[PDB]
Amino acid sequence: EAAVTQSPRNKVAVTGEKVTLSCQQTNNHNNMYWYRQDTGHGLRLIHYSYGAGNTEKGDIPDGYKASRPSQEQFSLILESATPSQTSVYFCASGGGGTLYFGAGTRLSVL
């Protein structure tokens, strides 16, 4: 029912493991975003995208890569997970200043 489908909803990883989080929207939104949720529930910007093929660094990019292979998909990649990446993550999409959020991903790194 939601315009932005984020997957998986949960992920358990061991230190050193590669993790990919998916964000899919079929509203034809040009912009997409990946945020990490802090202990005060602030959303800190990791990476974003202005359209298919484009990725841009946010405020906390270190330790993550982003990929925009099509209009509909924006992926977040942790090449080698660390305990410090234990967090909740949220993706978003929209045109202009509009933010349509995904439902979130809970990540635990052991």
Side-chain angles (χ1 to χ4, degrees):
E1 184 184 322
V4 174
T5 301
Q6 197 188 135
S7 69
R9 295 296 311 281
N10 297 270
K11 183 67 174 183
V12 180
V14 167
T15 297
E17 183 170 350
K18 183 189 173 170
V19 171
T20 302
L21 317 181
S22 164
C23 187
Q24 174 189 111
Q25 51 98 10
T26 49
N27 278 214
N28 203 35
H29 291 157
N30 288 341
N31 312 136
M32 303 190 66
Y33 311 83
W34 272 110
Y35 291 96
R36 186 188 164 154
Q37 180 194 257
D38 72 28
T39 63
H41 285 66
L43 291 167
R44 292 182 186 277
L45 184 63
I46 306 160
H47 293 291
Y48 59 100
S49 173
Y50 292 122
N54 170 256
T55 55
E56 308 279 327
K57 291 178 171 86
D59 292 316
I60 53 156
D62 290 344
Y64 304 96
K65 174 176 166 310
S67 167
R68 182 84 184 269
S70 65
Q71 179 84 331
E72 65 188 9
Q73 175 62 221
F74 188 48
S75 309
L76 182 70
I77 300 144
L78 295 61
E79 223 63 67
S80 187
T82 60
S84 68
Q85 296 174 308
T86 297
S87 201
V88 186
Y89 298 82
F90 287 93
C91 83
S93 70
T98 298
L99 297 168
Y100 276 83
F101 280 94
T105 295
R106 301 165 73 178
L107 174 71
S108 170
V109 184
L110 302 178

